[PDB]
DNA sequence: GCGATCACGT
DNA sequence: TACGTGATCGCA
């Protein structure tokens, strides 16, 4: 039983409570709060949001840091409250983040899934209450109130077993001193948003739309007919049946038309390069021009991404609506999209700082490979140095292609692709790709020892850990299916690297946020993109940020090799180059 | 709505 | 044959 409360009472304002501030819209920015549940020592309460959020006592309680609250996904509630001008403070336990740390593979995305991990089932899955997709809807107050109170009661009951297991895992500080403080920082970043120059995007979209119209009609003349170029099935009929082009790779449905195969088909027919060009432009047009414009808020002309802090199995952040971690950078045609991301105030600039090879540096530290550590202590170009060692040549004799291949090997450790994926990366036979790995391991015997030892440790312990004690369980490491086992082995290798790099960037973000307030700067964190932090700040703060930001990021952790940070500022994201 | 394909980032 | 998000198409 619970109290369907008409008025906020003092007993609802205890200094420890499980709190539910329910935002049902997936995108919680400027989104309705549909109800509020409080469970504490005095009872279980349901409050109507129009009532509670108009009560000065309740609002003050929400903002009192000394009034401790346990929640699930507090960032959703905090951001939704920010859009109403209300601060949420004192969240001392976030069940979503706790469950994520305990086992990222469970996919915990509602209270019921977290509660199941502790054999607590007195709460329904959110999707059973709200429905899915089209039929999604807020239910009537009795149904809604019961659900919110049950979620709050679950959070109340589950704090102690989650904290206990975190303590046993040595993840208590990881939760309380890293992920939870980071959650508040992400909330501010999402709420601030990034200003977009929508007229420049529209101008880009106009230039693409005319270039698409031209490549499109060229393709139809080359195909002798019109067809849906965006339809991989139809393009497959044109290329492989009508034009008799050789089939170099298959997919489950039919023949591949990936940029992979197309480049190898270009010498056979004029249409292929035009198809490729059409795919480039259409990717920019559909995903990046039209995609961004769809999610710019016309009130603020900002995009307000949502960082998902409890999703990746490595501890990396992901971001959605829009995903700003895949804005093109590699090709100039697509890099120019970043010119659309501008400072949100006049006479401010974008400041971007990025770790140089943090993943390989983490590997050098974790593997204690003398050669790799020395390379970073010498601040060498790691790809050039790797080519020198693999091919047994001096720096003067590294060709561009030798560096490209060494870079692909290093790439294949940072991500832990298969030797098959290396072979395919370098368009080289699987066997020659294998003697590349072997030459690498004789030049870097500490990395080899690390790969072997971490695989054994994953098998023996059942999981691998990162520098800050994030863990990833790898049950497939004992599998008899070769492909399933190999992937688990690669994850055993890659996760302490990628996850430790993620850990360092998170600590840097926390340290930078504290330092920015210490220094009384107006600079504000806007975006993290895996290895980069992007800020905006008055132009009068650039010079201080050039010293402060790299210092904070480089001192976030002490490794056996230096951390190196490159930084740039400019009038747009593009120009912060 | 779902699976399959493709492609973008780190 | 890292970690993802998202657009499109084709099918029921």
Author numbering: 300 to 876
Could you pull the original sentences from the published paper?
Recently, we investigated the mechanism of a bacterial DNA polymerase I member isolated from the thermophilic species Geobacillus stearothermophilus, Bst, by X-ray crystallography. Here we follow the reaction pathway of Bst DNA polymerase by time-resolved X-ray crystallography. In contrast to the canonical model where translocation is thought to be the last step in the catalytic cycle, time-lapsed images capturing the order and transition between intermediates demonstrate that translocation precedes phosphodiester bond formation in the mechanism of DNA synthesis. The translocation step appears to follow a push-pull mechanism where the O-O1 loop of the finger subdomain acts as a latch or pawl to facilitate unidirectional movement along the template.
For each time-dependent assay, individual crystals were transferred to an equilibration buffer [0.1 M MES (pH 7.0), 50% (NH4)2SO4, and 2.5% MPD] for 30 min at 294 K. The catalytic cycle was then initiated by transferring the crystals to reaction buffer containing 2’-deoxyadenosine triphosphate (dATP) [equilibration buffer supplemented with dATP]. The datasets acquired at 1, 4, 8, and 120 min (refined to 1.9–2.3 Å) reproducibly yield unique intermediates with high occupancy (>80%). The starting conformation observed at 0 min shows an active site configuration in which Y714 stacks directly over the 3′ end of the primer (position 10, P10) and the unpaired portion of the template strand takes a sharp turn (~90°) at the base of the finger subdomain with the next 5′ base (thymine at template position 5, T5) held outside the active site by a stacking interaction with the side chain of Y719. This movement of the finger subdomain causes the dsDNA duplex to shift ~6 Å to a position where Y714 now stacks directly over the center of the DNA duplex.
